[PDB]
Amino acid sequence: VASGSGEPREEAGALGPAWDESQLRSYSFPTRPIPRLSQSDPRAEELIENEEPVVLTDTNLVYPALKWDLEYLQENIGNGDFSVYSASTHKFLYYDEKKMANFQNFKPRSNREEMKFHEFVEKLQDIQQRGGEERLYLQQTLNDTVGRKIVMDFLGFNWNWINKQQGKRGWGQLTSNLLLIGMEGNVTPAHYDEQQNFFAQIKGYKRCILFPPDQFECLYPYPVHHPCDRQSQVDFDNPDYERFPNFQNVVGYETVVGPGDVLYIPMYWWHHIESLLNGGITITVNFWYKGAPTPKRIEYPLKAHQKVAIMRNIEKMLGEALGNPQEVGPLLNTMIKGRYN
Ligand SMILES: O=C(O)CNC(=O)c1ncc(-c2cc(-c3cccc(Cl)c3)no2)cc1O
Ligand SMILES: [Zn+2]
């Protein structure tokens, strides 16, 4: 019952439907729509305050970036080195390189490669000509090495609105802005992040499927010390119900964001992102903020994301107390077998 994005929106000027369901991939779980609201709507304000997702339609957060395409960026983004991830499949499973030492019998299926922006544009054009099925994804934090016109657009962002959001929520500093340029059909598999995220869509359309933190049991993340920490072990395209039985109980929140839309992805919320099939390249800029500090007085019962934080810290402490992350598993099983299960 994954009819969660509602009926496709009609573009202004009678330009037809922005998308159709044939461009969405099919999955085994039901979803329900994420609310699409105006930033002036108080309902959207209490959704963000209570850490629930919402699509804001009229923030003008990245208004100067809506003119961006591959040509404009190649001319103005500068000559810095851009992280580009390759893959032979539509799923871009990212991995922590610093944690690759803990798991030697782990081979990554999507390698990173730095390059110039013109090399990335060229590498895309070869694949389209060659008819190849290799897929690329540019994920690069913007810094000071960008050209003059790009800094013009960056300064043109609606900092008034997003800084006021940072203050009202007690969030920490803006950690980074990640520029995402992906091919059609590209998929970022389900994972969660430990920061608050404003997902500002620029070019193309992306389907975003979100799961609240209380569905930890249904999504089976890798061990904290695994390179794929915070990512789900479940193959959404071929779910192993024997290893992951509670994935049969997972329920999602779904929406399709287009140019001008801003999706609030609350901290610790799972998200599965896919660029719509046959929808052209996609461009996104997201804004990451450190969450509000833990309050002095602890209120019980704990929120679901607090229990996830407790589980992460236990795995972390266990890994350094034993001197080897590989012993975390056997000791945890020893602790519960015949005692808590
Ligand atoms: O595709 C879309 O539109 C949506 N993209 C996302 O949601 C998204 N979010 C967060 C991250 C991320 C990856 C890491 C990281 C990876 C490997 C090693 C190390 Cl050290 C750090 N940190 O953050 C990547 C993402 O793709
Ligand atoms: Zn993420």
mmCIF file of all heavy atoms in Angstrom, residues 94 178 180 188-195 197 199 230 265 269-273 286 288, ligand 2:
data_model
loop_
_atom_site.group_PDB
_atom_site.id
_atom_site.type_symbol
_atom_site.label_atom_id
_atom_site.label_comp_id
_atom_site.label_asym_id
_atom_site.label_seq_id
_atom_site.Cartn_x
_atom_site.Cartn_y
_atom_site.Cartn_z
ATOM 1 N N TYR A 94 26.826 3.765 0.972
ATOM 2 C CA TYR A 94 28.018 4.452 1.453
ATOM 3 C C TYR A 94 28.598 3.734 2.665
ATOM 4 O O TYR A 94 27.886 3.077 3.428
ATOM 5 C CB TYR A 94 27.731 5.926 1.793
ATOM 6 C CG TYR A 94 26.932 6.227 3.061
ATOM 7 C CD1 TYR A 94 27.525 6.174 4.322
ATOM 8 C CD2 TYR A 94 25.602 6.630 2.988
ATOM 9 C CE1 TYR A 94 26.802 6.471 5.475
ATOM 10 C CE2 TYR A 94 24.873 6.932 4.134
ATOM 11 C CZ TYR A 94 25.476 6.851 5.373
ATOM 12 O OH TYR A 94 24.741 7.153 6.500
ATOM 13 N N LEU A 178 25.724 19.977 1.936
ATOM 14 C CA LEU A 178 26.130 18.955 0.983
ATOM 15 C C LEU A 178 25.394 19.171 -0.332
ATOM 16 O O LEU A 178 24.161 19.247 -0.356
ATOM 17 C CB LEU A 178 25.850 17.553 1.526
ATOM 18 C CG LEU A 178 26.620 16.390 0.900
ATOM 19 C CD1 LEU A 178 28.112 16.569 1.118
ATOM 20 C CD2 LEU A 178 26.147 15.065 1.478
ATOM 21 N N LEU A 180 24.274 17.611 -3.748
ATOM 22 C CA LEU A 180 24.019 16.295 -4.318
ATOM 23 C C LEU A 180 23.575 16.453 -5.762
ATOM 24 O O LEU A 180 22.575 17.123 -6.038
ATOM 25 C CB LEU A 180 22.961 15.541 -3.514
ATOM 26 C CG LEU A 180 23.263 15.412 -2.023
ATOM 27 C CD1 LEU A 180 22.236 14.534 -1.347
ATOM 28 C CD2 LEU A 180 24.658 14.861 -1.812
ATOM 29 N N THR A 188 19.601 6.225 -2.608
ATOM 30 C CA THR A 188 20.345 6.214 -1.360
ATOM 31 C C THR A 188 19.589 5.324 -0.389
ATOM 32 O O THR A 188 18.508 5.715 0.076
ATOM 33 C CB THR A 188 20.493 7.625 -0.792
ATOM 34 O OG1 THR A 188 21.243 8.433 -1.706
ATOM 35 C CG2 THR A 188 21.214 7.586 0.544
ATOM 36 N N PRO A 189 20.084 4.126 -0.079
ATOM 37 C CA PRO A 189 19.312 3.189 0.750
ATOM 38 C C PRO A 189 19.069 3.726 2.152
ATOM 39 O O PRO A 189 19.695 4.682 2.615
ATOM 40 C CB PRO A 189 20.182 1.927 0.773
ATOM 41 C CG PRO A 189 21.546 2.384 0.374
ATOM 42 C CD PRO A 189 21.333 3.524 -0.572
ATOM 43 N N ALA A 190 18.132 3.069 2.836
ATOM 44 C CA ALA A 190 17.628 3.549 4.117
ATOM 45 C C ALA A 190 18.741 3.681 5.149
ATOM 46 O O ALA A 190 19.558 2.773 5.327
ATOM 47 C CB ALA A 190 16.542 2.605 4.635
ATOM 48 N N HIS A 191 18.754 4.817 5.838
ATOM 49 C CA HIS A 191 19.724 5.099 6.884
ATOM 50 C C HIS A 191 19.169 6.231 7.733
ATOM 51 O O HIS A 191 18.188 6.882 7.365
ATOM 52 C CB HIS A 191 21.080 5.485 6.298
ATOM 53 C CG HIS A 191 21.073 6.822 5.629
ATOM 54 N ND1 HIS A 191 20.609 7.007 4.345
ATOM 55 C CD2 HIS A 191 21.447 8.044 6.075
ATOM 56 C CE1 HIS A 191 20.708 8.284 4.024
ATOM 57 N NE2 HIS A 191 21.215 8.935 5.055
ATOM 58 N N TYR A 192 19.812 6.471 8.872
ATOM 59 C CA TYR A 192 19.476 7.620 9.697
ATOM 60 C C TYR A 192 20.731 8.435 9.973
ATOM 61 O O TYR A 192 21.857 7.940 9.874
ATOM 62 C CB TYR A 192 18.795 7.211 11.015
ATOM 63 C CG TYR A 192 19.667 6.462 12.000
ATOM 64 C CD1 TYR A 192 20.411 7.143 12.959
ATOM 65 C CD2 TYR A 192 19.723 5.071 11.994
ATOM 66 C CE1 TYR A 192 21.199 6.464 13.870
ATOM 67 C CE2 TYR A 192 20.510 4.382 12.904
ATOM 68 C CZ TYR A 192 21.245 5.084 13.838
ATOM 69 O OH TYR A 192 22.029 4.407 14.744
ATOM 70 N N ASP A 193 20.520 9.705 10.306
ATOM 71 C CA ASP A 193 21.595 10.624 10.635
ATOM 72 C C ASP A 193 21.372 11.181 12.032
ATOM 73 O O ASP A 193 20.236 11.281 12.507
ATOM 74 C CB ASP A 193 21.684 11.771 9.615
ATOM 75 C CG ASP A 193 21.999 11.280 8.214
ATOM 76 O OD1 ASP A 193 23.018 10.577 8.047
ATOM 77 O OD2 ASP A 193 21.218 11.581 7.285
ATOM 78 N N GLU A 194 22.475 11.537 12.688
ATOM 79 C CA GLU A 194 22.456 12.058 14.046
ATOM 80 C C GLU A 194 22.343 13.576 14.092
ATOM 81 O O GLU A 194 22.649 14.181 15.125
ATOM 82 C CB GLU A 194 23.707 11.599 14.798
ATOM 83 C CG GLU A 194 23.726 10.106 15.091
ATOM 84 C CD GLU A 194 24.989 9.660 15.801
ATOM 85 O OE1 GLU A 194 26.007 9.422 15.117
ATOM 86 O OE2 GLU A 194 24.963 9.551 17.044
ATOM 87 N N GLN A 195 21.914 14.202 13.000
ATOM 88 C CA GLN A 195 21.756 15.646 12.942
ATOM 89 C C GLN A 195 20.416 15.990 12.307
ATOM 90 O O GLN A 195 19.806 15.177 11.609
ATOM 91 C CB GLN A 195 22.902 16.304 12.160
ATOM 92 C CG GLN A 195 24.276 16.100 12.790
ATOM 93 C CD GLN A 195 25.347 16.980 12.173
ATOM 94 O OE1 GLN A 195 25.093 17.712 11.217
ATOM 95 N NE2 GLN A 195 26.554 16.915 12.724
ATOM 96 N N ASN A 197 18.147 17.887 9.604
ATOM 97 C CA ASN A 197 18.408 18.071 8.184
ATOM 98 C C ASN A 197 17.266 18.829 7.525
ATOM 99 O O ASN A 197 16.096 18.464 7.680
ATOM 100 C CB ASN A 197 18.618 16.719 7.490
ATOM 101 C CG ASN A 197 18.925 16.858 6.009
ATOM 102 O OD1 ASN A 197 19.147 17.958 5.506
ATOM 103 N ND2 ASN A 197 18.948 15.732 5.304
ATOM 104 N N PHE A 199 16.262 19.453 3.797
ATOM 105 C CA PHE A 199 16.562 18.822 2.513
ATOM 106 C C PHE A 199 15.917 19.678 1.428
ATOM 107 O O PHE A 199 14.722 19.549 1.151
ATOM 108 C CB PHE A 199 16.027 17.390 2.535
ATOM 109 C CG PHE A 199 16.376 16.560 1.329
ATOM 110 C CD1 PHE A 199 17.523 15.783 1.313
ATOM 111 C CD2 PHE A 199 15.520 16.501 0.241
ATOM 112 C CE1 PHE A 199 17.831 14.996 0.217
ATOM 113 C CE2 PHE A 199 15.820 15.715 -0.857
ATOM 114 C CZ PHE A 199 16.977 14.962 -0.869
ATOM 115 N N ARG A 230 24.740 2.948 10.761
ATOM 116 C CA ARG A 230 23.538 3.773 10.627
ATOM 117 C C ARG A 230 22.723 3.416 9.387
ATOM 118 O O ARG A 230 21.656 4.007 9.184
ATOM 119 C CB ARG A 230 23.838 5.283 10.611
ATOM 120 C CG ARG A 230 24.479 5.799 11.894
ATOM 121 C CD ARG A 230 24.847 7.275 11.797
ATOM 122 N NE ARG A 230 26.001 7.501 10.929
ATOM 123 C CZ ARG A 230 25.930 8.010 9.703
ATOM 124 N NH1 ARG A 230 24.756 8.357 9.192
ATOM 125 N NH2 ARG A 230 27.034 8.178 8.988
ATOM 126 N N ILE A 265 13.910 16.560 7.613
ATOM 127 C CA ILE A 265 14.173 15.191 8.047
ATOM 128 C C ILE A 265 14.644 15.254 9.494
ATOM 129 O O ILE A 265 15.804 15.612 9.747
ATOM 130 C CB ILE A 265 15.211 14.501 7.148
ATOM 131 C CG1 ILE A 265 14.775 14.560 5.682
ATOM 132 C CG2 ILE A 265 15.414 13.056 7.581
ATOM 133 C CD1 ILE A 265 15.722 13.850 4.739
ATOM 134 N N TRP A 269 15.595 10.027 12.238
ATOM 135 C CA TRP A 269 14.573 9.458 11.370
ATOM 136 C C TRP A 269 15.231 8.765 10.185
ATOM 137 O O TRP A 269 16.078 9.353 9.508
ATOM 138 C CB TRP A 269 13.613 10.542 10.877
ATOM 139 C CG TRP A 269 12.498 10.846 11.831
ATOM 140 C CD1 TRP A 269 12.610 11.392 13.076
ATOM 141 C CD2 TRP A 269 11.098 10.630 11.613
ATOM 142 N NE1 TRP A 269 11.369 11.526 13.650
ATOM 143 C CE2 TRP A 269 10.423 11.064 12.772
ATOM 144 C CE3 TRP A 269 10.350 10.109 10.552
ATOM 145 C CZ2 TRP A 269 9.037 10.990 12.901
ATOM 146 C CZ3 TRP A 269 8.973 10.038 10.681
ATOM 147 C CH2 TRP A 269 8.332 10.474 11.848
ATOM 148 N N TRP A 270 14.850 7.512 9.943
ATOM 149 C CA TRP A 270 15.318 6.812 8.754
ATOM 150 C C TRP A 270 14.812 7.520 7.505
ATOM 151 O O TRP A 270 13.715 8.085 7.496
ATOM 152 C CB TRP A 270 14.833 5.359 8.760
ATOM 153 C CG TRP A 270 15.324 4.548 9.924
ATOM 154 C CD1 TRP A 270 14.804 4.526 11.187
ATOM 155 C CD2 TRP A 270 16.423 3.629 9.930
ATOM 156 N NE1 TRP A 270 15.516 3.660 11.979
ATOM 157 C CE2 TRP A 270 16.515 3.095 11.230
ATOM 158 C CE3 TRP A 270 17.340 3.208 8.963
ATOM 159 C CZ2 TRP A 270 17.486 2.161 11.587
ATOM 160 C CZ3 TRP A 270 18.303 2.282 9.320
ATOM 161 C CH2 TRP A 270 18.368 1.770 10.620
ATOM 162 N N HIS A 271 15.619 7.503 6.445
ATOM 163 C CA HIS A 271 15.172 8.024 5.161
ATOM 164 C C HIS A 271 15.777 7.226 4.017
ATOM 165 O O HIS A 271 16.971 6.913 4.018
ATOM 166 C CB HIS A 271 15.493 9.521 4.980
ATOM 167 C CG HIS A 271 16.811 9.947 5.547
ATOM 168 N ND1 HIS A 271 17.037 10.057 6.902
ATOM 169 C CD2 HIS A 271 17.958 10.338 4.942
ATOM 170 C CE1 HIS A 271 18.274 10.475 7.108
ATOM 171 N NE2 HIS A 271 18.853 10.654 5.935
ATOM 172 N N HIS A 272 14.922 6.893 3.056
ATOM 173 C CA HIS A 272 15.286 6.244 1.804
ATOM 174 C C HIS A 272 14.985 7.236 0.688
ATOM 175 O O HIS A 272 13.844 7.690 0.555
ATOM 176 C CB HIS A 272 14.497 4.940 1.637
ATOM 177 C CG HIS A 272 14.429 4.424 0.232
ATOM 178 N ND1 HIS A 272 15.150 3.329 -0.194
ATOM 179 C CD2 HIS A 272 13.696 4.828 -0.834
ATOM 180 C CE1 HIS A 272 14.879 3.093 -1.466
ATOM 181 N NE2 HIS A 272 14.001 3.988 -1.878
ATOM 182 N N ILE A 273 16.005 7.591 -0.092
ATOM 183 C CA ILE A 273 15.894 8.621 -1.121
ATOM 184 C C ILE A 273 16.183 7.990 -2.474
ATOM 185 O O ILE A 273 17.195 7.299 -2.638
ATOM 186 C CB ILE A 273 16.857 9.796 -0.867
ATOM 187 C CG1 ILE A 273 16.820 10.235 0.599
ATOM 188 C CG2 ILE A 273 16.517 10.963 -1.783
ATOM 189 C CD1 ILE A 273 15.534 10.904 1.015
ATOM 190 N N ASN A 286 21.327 20.101 1.081
ATOM 191 C CA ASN A 286 20.758 19.918 2.404
ATOM 192 C C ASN A 286 21.587 20.659 3.443
ATOM 193 O O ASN A 286 22.773 20.941 3.247
ATOM 194 C CB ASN A 286 20.630 18.433 2.766
ATOM 195 C CG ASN A 286 21.886 17.653 2.483
ATOM 196 O OD1 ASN A 286 22.995 18.151 2.665
ATOM 197 N ND2 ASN A 286 21.721 16.418 2.027
ATOM 198 N N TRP A 288 22.656 20.662 7.451
ATOM 199 C CA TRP A 288 22.769 19.834 8.645
ATOM 200 C C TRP A 288 23.084 20.696 9.859
ATOM 201 O O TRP A 288 24.038 21.481 9.841
ATOM 202 C CB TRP A 288 23.837 18.753 8.471
ATOM 203 C CG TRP A 288 23.307 17.501 7.851
ATOM 204 C CD1 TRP A 288 22.330 16.690 8.351
ATOM 205 C CD2 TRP A 288 23.729 16.909 6.619
ATOM 206 N NE1 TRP A 288 22.112 15.632 7.502
ATOM 207 C CE2 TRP A 288 22.959 15.742 6.433
ATOM 208 C CE3 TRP A 288 24.680 17.252 5.655
ATOM 209 C CZ2 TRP A 288 23.112 14.920 5.321
ATOM 210 C CZ3 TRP A 288 24.831 16.431 4.554
ATOM 211 C CH2 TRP A 288 24.051 15.280 4.395
HETATM 212 ZN ZN ZN B 2 20.900 10.980 5.367
#
